């Protein structure tokens, strides 16, 4: 599975960019779960936006607006 495709070195890299030194073995699954939940929310919002737009293709505009719905505004796209 490609959710398992997220490799352990990637999660180690992420936690270290956060600023950790030692990482336990139970962190990777929780990181995958939280990423899955955030993705589920953003995708559901983007999909309902594009379903209203009666288009079979989503757009960076719709992704930005899902992000603005979540309150995490993203810059450098759309406009």
């Amino acid at each position: 599975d490609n959710i398992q495709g997220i490799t352990k070195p990637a999660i180690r890299r992420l936690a270290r960019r956060g600023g950790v030194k030692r990482i336990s073995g139970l962190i990777y699954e929780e990181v995958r779960a939280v990423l899955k939940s955030f993705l589920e929310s953003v995708i559901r919002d983007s999909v309902t936006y594009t379903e209203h737009a009666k288009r079979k293709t989503v757009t960076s505009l719709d992704v930005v607006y899902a992000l603005k719905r979540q309150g995490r505004t993203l810059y450098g796209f759309g406009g």
Partner: protein, 97 residues
């Protein structure tokens, strides 16, 4: 010493600005997730700049969560981020929960 190499690569990732998760697997992940949400009549379509946008927001959120977990770890006198610490960070920030 392991600490020397560890701190050297901490330096390089502190002044690094590239994506850390593989592009094709991440694209496949969002691909299959949004097909999972879909009815059987159609399939959705996606675009590369949208993929970068979603990945960029995803790792912004992830870096925030991980640095907060590191702060909890410092609070708990342990340099190791662990299950209870991550649970506590998720609860306290409490987004879409």
């Amino acid at each position: 010493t392991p600490s020397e190499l560890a701190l050297y690569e901490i330096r390089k990732y502190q002044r690094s600005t590239d994506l850390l998760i593989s592009k094709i697997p991440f694209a496949r992940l969002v691909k299959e997730v949004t097909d999972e949400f879909t009815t059987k009549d159609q399939d959705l379509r996606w675009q590369s700049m949208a993929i970068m946008a979603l990945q960029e927001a995803s790792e912004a959120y992830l870096v925030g969560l991980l640095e907060h977990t590191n702060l909890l770890a410092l609070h708990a006198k342990r340099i190791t981020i662990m299950k209870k610490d991550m649970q506590l960070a998720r609860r306290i920030r409490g987004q879409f929960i």
